[PDB]
Design a protein around this ligand. Structure first.
Ligand SMILES: CC(=O)N[C@H]1[C@@H](OP(=O)(O)OP(=O)(O)OC[C@H]2O[C@@H](n3ccc(=O)[nH]c3=O)[C@H](O)[C@@H]2O)O[C@H](CO)[C@@H](O)[C@@H]1O
Length: 286
């Protein structure tokens, strides 16, 4: 399975922070925002990843992350000329995807919870159908909304429904089989090519599966100044009090066996006259 990070968009709501800096390059505590969704692809077991951003921002992401070899993965880059919908990721990413299954994660989404990687690995390993992730939010009408009623079997999915039919937002993380590329080509503007029609396609096939994230999963709003700060405080809090790191790419690569001890030490050194190395050195001499 391949992955795609859709990491473009306008800065507007975060202005002036985003006047000369890409949204998904802003700090979330101690890491660029894009580390977080990248880490979710990695934890899923996905090692071949395309990062799509604006023509302006895409060279900056390449500069940050390069081709991915120091994490033991492959990163490629393409450009979204204009933000005409999430489903465009599959048109732009058509050649990258090939015949493969593919996950899409949004560059501003932040996921956390103790059972989360098992959930990612399971979704990555379903060769058929689509898996989405629902999250109990206070303001359903601001997102995609999924209704189920079971048994947890999906019954409808509406984008920003004037009145909602559940408390469950459809978060910015989606797993697909290869049929998604023909599906994206075949949907029509709602002016956006919308991820919610992609998901309605799987639903009419009866092959749209939802993971409901309840106690105790986090999904962090990254949209406003206040919610960016909240996200940052959450990561710091959980890292400081529970002695773990969230989305530490180097740690994740090492723990999944992608890179060796010696490769990790090399990644940590240039970072030693700082903290972030130190946690990496502690880990590399187990
Ligand atoms: C796509 C859409 O209509 N709604 C989804 C979108 O809502 P939402 O209301 O967040 O719409 P956004 O435009 O903020 O989610 C889009 C995010 O991806 C980026 N972007 C958007 C379009 C594009 O062509 N390229 C691009 O990179 C935007 O910069 C933004 O970061 O994400 C939510 C989860 O986070 C979902 O619950 C919604 O179902």
């Amino acid at each position: 399975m391949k992955g795609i990070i859709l990491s473009g968009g306008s800065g507007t709501r975060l202005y002036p922070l985003t006047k000369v800096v890409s949204k998904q390059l802003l700090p979330v505590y101690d890491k660029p925002m894009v580390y977080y969704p990248l880490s979710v692809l990695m934890l899923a077991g996905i090692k071949d990843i395309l990062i799509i951003s604006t023509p302006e921002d895409t060279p900056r992401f390449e500069q940050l992350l390069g081709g991915g070899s120091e994490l033991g993965i492959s990163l490629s880059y393409a450009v979204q000329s204009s933000p005409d919908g999430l489903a465009q990721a599959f048109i732009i990413g058509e050649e990258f995807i090939g015949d493969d299954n593919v996950a899409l994660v949004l560059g501003d989404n932040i996921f956390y919870g103790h059972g989360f990687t098992e959930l990612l690995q399971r979704a990555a390993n379903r060769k058929s159908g689509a898996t989405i992730f629902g999250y109990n939010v206070k303001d359903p009408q601001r997102f995609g909304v999924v209704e189920f009623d079971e048994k947890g079997k999906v019954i409808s999915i509406e984008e920003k429904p004037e009145e909602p039919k559940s408390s469950y937002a459809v978060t910015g993380l989606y797993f697909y089989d290869n049929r998604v590329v023909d599906i994206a080509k075949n949907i029509t503007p709602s002016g956006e090519l919308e991820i919610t029609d992609v998901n309605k396609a799987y639903l009419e096939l009866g092959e749209l599966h939802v993971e409901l994230l309840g106690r105790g999963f986090a999904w962090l709003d990254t949209g406003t100044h206040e919610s960016l700060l909240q996200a940052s405080q959450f990561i710091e809090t959980i890292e400081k009090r529970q002695s773990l790191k969230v989305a530490c790419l180097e740690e994740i690569a090492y723990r999944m066996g992608y890179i060796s001890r010696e490769q990790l030490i090399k990644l940590a050194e240039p970072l030693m006259k700082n903290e972030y190395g130190q946690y990496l050195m502690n880990l590399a001499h187990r």
